Symmetry: C3
Subunit: 148 residues, 3 copies
């Protein structure tokens, strides 16, 4: 047997996320051409700095997303986690587009991405609680018993 | 039984990648001493900014590499994925060395790293397609059948 | 059967790490308000630049930590890896607090975080060596045998 089936949606969402990050990167290179900024050096016009910063921020959050997606998907529920992941990634795409246009337009999709991510966290937390708390509670009761 | 055997090459390549990242970090600290830059603050001579930026970029791509390596290795083929990973990591080492010497010398190994990574993506995509597409196609046919 | 049991501590430490990263992020937003820095743009007073840089560095190391935690936990020993992970994360929290106050105060917890992480690396390396080296050594002997 294989456990590919138990994680395939997580893997698909993960790959989609990688692809999205790649898209962000190409958008950064394109802003580097458009606004004439050569590597190294990450300062230039406001629009470049916004696109660049949107990419940096997405990159910074991407491992957090992956970690929680997987923990939630394995410990809580695969489908829920994948859905939350899809919502998160879509929110991040909109974040990147907004930020690229204006700092303020990054905000609505930013909030959406954050809501989905904390939800992923909550599912992870609940799943882990479900795993550890019963055995822990039993062990505590046994020690009390004890009396006897 | 354990699934360590099914992922050991992925794990080895992963660890090698971590080690390589550590190497990049130590190279950055060494440039911080050589070109007299004290934390925080990441601006200084061109050579420092290049070494620093090479490290930043490698760091930024490292989770993307890990994600795709694992998805490709689990869904497509472990050995192929690990090989692509090795090529990628070697390419990144050369990227870092080039960039450290000159922005332009970062370019050839950069292209090599990108080719290997998209290959990892393609293997991931193919592996996932192989997982989902048959069941999906069957389900679609069944709905057509239906007639009857 | 499920392998949740074999990775639950790794998952818990991972989630704790994500939560800690989130904390760092909120601390950065709070410094953005306190020291009046609006996105994009990551320059401002020294204290902001230190908090920001502490967050950036933690973010940069977080995937390395995750990779090694998991490899060590799967290939060497789950409990040891999780413990090292806890020590690492605590060290990083102290790192962030120190850096936030003064660059120099980042140093002691920084060294602690590095010691724990290399230990994670060593466990990963030993676990992987244990997996590959016997089969490899046998294969080499068989080829020698050979004679005959
Ligand atoms: N923020 C960018 C860094 C990333 C980027 O936009 N481009 C990549 C290469 S983009 C090529 C295609 C996308 C890469 C990839 C990644 C993950 C999966 C698929 C494709 C890069 O290596 N830039 C720095 C350099 O030239 O050394 C920058 O610093 O300029
Ligand atoms: N780009 C660097 C950040 C990383 C770096 O080069 N050094 C590490 C520590 S390097 C020590 C050895 C390598 C760390 C490690 C990581 C992963 C696996 C093994 C070893 C660091 O913590 N720098 C910032 C700081 O002093 O607070 C910088 O901002 O100066
Ligand atoms: N270093 C920060 C980036 C991250 C940060 O501090 N805040 C997050 C949002 S913090 C909200 C709560 C924490 C997010 C989260 C992440 C992981 C798990 C749980 C919660 C952010 O999106 N900043 C940039 C922007 O406004 O576009 C900066 O560039 O200002
Ligand atoms: Ni199994």
């Amino acid at each position: 047997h294989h456990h590919k089936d138990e994680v395939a949606l997580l893997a698909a969402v993960t790959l989609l996320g990688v692809l999205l990050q790649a898209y962000f990167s190409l958008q950064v290179i394109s802003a580097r051409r458009a606004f004439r900024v050569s590597p190294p050096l990450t300062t230039g016009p406001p629009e470049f700095e916004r696109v660049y910063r949107a990419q940096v921020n997405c990159s910074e959050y991407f491992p957090l997303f992956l970690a929680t997606l997987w923990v939630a998907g394995i410990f809580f529920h695969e489908g829920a986690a994948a859905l939350c992941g899809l919502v998160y990634l879509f929110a991040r795409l909109r974040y990147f587009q907004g930020y690229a246009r204006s700092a303020q337009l990054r905000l609505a999709p930013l909030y959406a991405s954050a809501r989905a991510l904390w939800l992923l966290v909550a599912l992870a937390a609940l799943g882990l609680l479900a795993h550890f708390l019963p055995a822990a509670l039993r062990a505590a009761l046994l020690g009390r018993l004890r009396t006897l």
